[PDB]
Amino acid sequence: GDVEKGKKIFVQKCAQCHTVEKGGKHKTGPNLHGLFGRKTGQAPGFTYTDANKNKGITWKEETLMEYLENPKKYIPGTKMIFAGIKKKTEREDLIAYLKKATNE
Amino acid sequence: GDVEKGKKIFVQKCAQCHTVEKGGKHKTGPNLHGLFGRKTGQAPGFTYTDANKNKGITWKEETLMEYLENPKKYIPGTKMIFAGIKKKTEREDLIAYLKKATNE
Ligand code: HEC
Ligand code: HEC
Fold this sequence. Notes:
Two copies of one chain form a homodimer. Chain A is mainly alpha-helical. Helix content of chain A is 41%, strand content 0%. Chain A contains five helices and no strands. The first copy, chain A, has helices at 3-13, 50-54, 61-69, 71-74, 88-101. The radius of gyration of chain A is 17 Å and the shape is extended. The termini of chain A are far apart. One heme C sits between chains B (13-14, 16-18, 28-30, 40-43, 48-49, 51-52, 68, 78-81) and A (81, 83, 85, 94). One heme C sits between chains A (13-14, 16-18, 28-30, 40-43, 48-49, 51-52, 68, 78-81) and B (81, 83, 85, 94). Chains A, B: Belongs to the cytochrome c family. Chains A, B: It comes from Equus caballus. Chains A, B: Keywords: Acetylation, Apoptosis, Electron transport, Heme, Iron, Metal-binding, Mitochondrion, Phosphoprotein, Respiratory chain, Transport. Chains A, B: Its main location: mitochondrion.
């Protein structure tokens, strides 16, 4: 495929949760350097779900083609995001803002 | 709670998928203006999951406190994001970029 086009997709759809750079940080999702030819759930230092840990397949063009079409269908139980707010005080403050902004 | 603090949480944790402004657009998630005192799944023009459509509760401080702690526990079946790429050519181009960047 077209690398130029792929880079833009990555930046728009994936970079908010993944880095690709050697030595790049884990974010919501794992750093992806060295992905190709590696089994699922094997970035060093990242805590996966059991589902992503145990999928047991090798990442390559064919498996990525299928995964990317629908990640949850290829790895049921995978979790991409936690959209909540665990701290009580942060929940109270956020709700205060929402109470104001969603009514003005 | 503290509105100043809530605004920053919102911008950091929620604004990527929700607007709060009257007349604001639906994004990944619904526009949230008029939320308080309204039942779940009722922003006009947004297509919810059946789960969020049918939760049947009224949004207010107490219900938001519980929802925000863990959205999926409060509304099982709710879906926050699709992280995949439906178009075949976009998948091919993205995979080409990944093949380069994750190996250099
Ligand atoms: C956050 C909201 C994410 C977005 C957007 C994308 N991904 Fe993701 N990805 C995310 C998490 C939390 C995980 C771990 C999931 C688990 O169940 O533990 C993943 C996983 C991957 C993988 C597999 C990685 C591995 O097995 O080592 C791949 C190949 C992957 N993600 C790629 C990817 C791409 C290309 C994305 C843009 C289209 C993308 N993800 C979006 C979090 C998030
Ligand atoms: C995208 C990755 C999201 C992030 C981050 C947050 N939310 Fe969200 N939210 C999202 C979607 C797709 C939906 C609809 C879900 C469905 O099952 O149909 C929601 C829903 C809400 C609701 C309920 C809205 C209603 O019933 O009308 C609320 C109150 C809500 N979201 C608030 C919210 C806040 C405060 C967030 C930051 C902490 C937040 N969401 C993150 C998508 C995403």
